[PDB]
From a paper:
Here we determined that the arbitrium system in Bacillus subtilis phage phi3T modulates the bacterial toxin–antitoxin system MazE–MazF to regulate the phage life cycle. AimX also inhibits the function of phi3T_93, a protein that promotes lysogeny by binding to MazE and releasing MazF. In all structures, phi3T_93 shows an identical all-helices fold composed of a longer N-terminal helix (α1), followed by two shorter helices (α2 and α3) connected by a long unstructured loop forming a V-like shape. The α1 helices of two phi3T_93 monomers interact, resulting in a W-shaped tight and globular dimer that displays two shallow grooves, one across each side of the dimer molecule.
We obtained the structure of phi3T_93 alone (wt and its N-terminal His-tagged version; His-phi3T_93) and in complex with AimX. Interestingly, in the His-phi3T_93 structure, the N-terminal His-tag folds as helices and are also accommodated in the dimer grooves replicating the AimX contacts, supporting the idea that the phi3T_93 grooves are specifically designed to accommodate a short helix. Size exclusion chromatography coupled to multi-angle light scattering (SEC–MALS) analysis confirmed the phi3T_93 dimeric organization in solution.
Numbering used by the authors:
A (entry chain A): -10 to 68
B (entry chain B): -10 to 69
Amino acid sequence: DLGTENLYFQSMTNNKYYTEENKKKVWKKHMIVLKFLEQPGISEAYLNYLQEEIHNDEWIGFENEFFEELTGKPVINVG
Amino acid sequence: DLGTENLYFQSMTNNKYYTEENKKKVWKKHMIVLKFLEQPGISEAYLNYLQEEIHNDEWIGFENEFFEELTGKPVINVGD
């Protein structure tokens, strides 16, 4: 709803919480969302979102990750 | 489309790739998707997805994370 800040997101900006417990939790919740993004309709809406969001200068420090998502590059590096 | 597996997903199942480089990359791509999920429409579709997916026995070892997503719990644990 209008005017709310996403406290859960703001937590992820603070290196204090970048612990081994939370990195594992995020990795697994990411795998969960990845399967949602395969759903008909959602993939196309996600890409539309990415095309707008890459212009948003609030995402400073995320340039490589955005480029990768925007271009359909692997989620992780397999070496 | 039919019969393809998500090779990117399958990589994430192998502990060989659970490196500090990839954990950081995943954390940031997760933050990117989190803002997408705030978009009108998407939030409701995600929850509908979760309600089906929790019965999918293929997600063994993910029980706590699913429960948390299904019930709107914090993405990460902030102690305090």
